[PDB]
């Protein structure tokens, strides 16, 4: 009978934290430094992250900037929901099979497995051809994460523009960063190197920069700057390239689309979005 919105998200700190439920199926009660309770939701998702492997769905705990944004959106517009983590663990790209298919949260939204994507989802032309994006909830860009001591100028460093097997730099597979290096001809020599070393997830790539396995990670500055502020052994290098925004994803015929963008505009104008930024990102 349900008219509950199927929300799809992905594991991406500090926007979406994913933790196991307690032995009773509830979430560990936590608080901010202020004494304010951390709002948490039950998000069903696969416990086996491994590729080309069976996905066993289990209830898990979700919280963060994007979950706090979901709760506010649901409260403003008066809708109910249920959250699940993207079955394949990807943001989403369009790949050739003759035919073209969308994977990740993009594929899930288009197939009807989701009614809404609530995640740090980059707004771009490729995805905007198939889905409706809300007005952005965050404006950021691409930066590079390296181990503390790795000296690099940025996107115009000779170690990136002239690739070699000595210095390994990558990004996340089936992500907007992957889309960006593929589309831009001026970055084909960088894409060609990256396609060989691209990781399944941001977490795996960040951990590989810690384990001296990956020398440079090209990813979202909102994530990378947050990671650098916590893990003092990692630093972000250079300034920002491909400045891009994050938005809520919906199907083009979604009846909520106008009310989602108005709620996001309201939240930026009344300081609520900046408060989320203060609680989770800074």
């Amino acid at each position: 009978m349900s008219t509950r919105l199927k929300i799809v998200t992905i594991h991406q700190e500090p926007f979406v934290y994913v933790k196991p439920t307690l032995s009773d199926g509830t979430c560990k009660e936590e608080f901010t430094v202020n004494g304010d309770p951390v709002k948490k939701v039950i998000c069903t998702g696969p416990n086996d992250t491994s590729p080309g492997s069976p996905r066993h769905t289990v209830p898990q705990c979700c919280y963060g900037f994007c979950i706090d944004l979901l709760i506010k959106l649901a409260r403003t517009m008066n809708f109910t929901y249920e959250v699940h983590l993207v079955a394949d663990g990807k943001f989403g790209t369009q790949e050739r099979v003759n035919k073209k298919e969308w994977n990740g949260m993009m594929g899930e939204l288009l197939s009807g497995q989701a009614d809404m994507i609530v995640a740090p989802l980059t707004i771009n032309n490729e995805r905007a051809q198939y889905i409706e994006f809300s007005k952005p909830f965050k404006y950021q860009g691409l930066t590079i994460l390296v181990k503390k001591g790795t000296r690099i100028t940025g996107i115009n460093d000779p170690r990136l523009r002239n690739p070699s097997d000595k210095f390994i730099y990558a990004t996340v597979k089936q992500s907007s960063v992957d889309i960006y290096f593929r589309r831009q001809v001026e970055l084909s020599t960088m894409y060609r190197h990256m396609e060989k070393h691209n990781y399944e997830s941001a977490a795996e790539a960040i951990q590989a920069v810690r384990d001296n396995k990956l020398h440079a990670f090209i990813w979202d500055s909102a994530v990378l700057e947050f990671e650098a502020s916590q893990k003092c052994d990692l630093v972000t290098t250079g300034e920002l390239f491909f400045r891009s925004g994050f938005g809520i994803g919906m199907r083009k015929d979604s009846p909520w689309k106008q009310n989602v963008s108005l709620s996001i505009l309201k939240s930026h104008e009344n300081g609520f979005m900046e408060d989320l930024d203060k609680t989770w990102v800074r």
Binding site: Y180, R243, L265, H268, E274
Partner: protein, 277 residues
């Protein structure tokens, strides 16, 4: 039906108006008309042929070429950006709302109340509210007790905005005491505000972030600055306003995201917005 009526408004460096050449529009300029009244005892007027250029004008040029339309560009004369007066919209918003323009192109801030009556394209420039002060002025930002509770100070902090735009509407909605206090410091325009600041007649000028950051970038002796590291409160963007259900919105949004993706927006920022300071 691809020859579109387009409304604009002067605000350097986004839209810059010049007199026609000695006898059409040359260089990087496009033709733009302005309805000019004969006298104030009549409704009679004449459209003056002028020339428009700037950051938003290059965006219009790119969109016209990509989205494949031609246009009749005019400068708004009934108000400025857009204000709802007794539920009646004036300015560039009003022109789109009352269907005298297919679209509004300029330094037009996307906000919730304007979004109820017009559709906005994806933002092409980030904006919001910034605070301009003389270098060294100690204020944390909008939340500073100097702005929030001004009479807690002797003498009180002197600050104002240019009324009737998105900055005033936001201050009105969020900080009622601050708003009613500020009205005595209302500035006629950006130029007067900067002069008021420099002549010590104003302590702070609260305004559109993208314009303030451009003004701070070009200030003589780099004296006037924006608080924080050019910080932005109630962060939003400039968007093209289109009529609700416009058949042009889809192609305009895709073209703008195409331009951003190809580094074309970053290029326009280099050409028009970057300053010395």
């Amino acid at each position: 039906d691809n020859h579109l009526s387009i409304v604009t408004l002067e605000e350097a460096p986004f839209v810059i108006v010049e007199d026609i050449d000695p006898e059409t529009c040359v260089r990087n300029t496009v033709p733009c008309r302005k309805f000019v009244k004969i006298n104030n005892s009549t409704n009679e007027g004449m459209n003056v042929k002028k020339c428009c250029k700037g950051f938003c004008i290059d965006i219009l040029k790119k969109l016209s070429r990509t989205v494949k339309f031609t246009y009749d560009l005019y400068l708004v004369t009934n108000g400025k950006h857009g204000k709802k007066v007794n539920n009646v919209w004036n300015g560039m918003i009003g022109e789109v709302v009352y269907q005298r323009a297919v679209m509004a192109v300029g330094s037009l801030t996307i906000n919730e109340e304007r979004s109820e009556v017009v559709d906005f394209s994806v933002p092409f420039v980030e904006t919001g509210i910034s605070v301009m002060v003389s270098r060294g002025t100690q204020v944390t930002g909008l939340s500073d007790k100097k702005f929030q509770r001004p009479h807690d100070y002797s003498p009180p902090f002197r600050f104002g905005t240019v009324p009737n735009g998105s900055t005033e509407r936001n201050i009105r909605n969020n900080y009622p005491y601050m708003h009613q206090y500020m009205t005595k410091f209302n500035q006629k325009g950006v130029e007067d505000a900067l002069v008021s600041l420099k002549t010590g007649k104003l302590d702070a000028f609260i305004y559109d972030a993208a314009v303030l950051n451009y003004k701070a970038g070009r200030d003589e002796g780099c004296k006037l600055v924006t608080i924080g590291s050019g910080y932005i409160f109630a962060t939003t963007g400039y968007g093209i306003a289109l009529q609700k259900g416009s058949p042009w919105k889809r192609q305009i949004d895709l073209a703008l995201l195409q331009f951003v993706g190809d580094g074309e927006m970053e290029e326009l920022e280099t050409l028009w917005l970057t300053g010395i300071c």
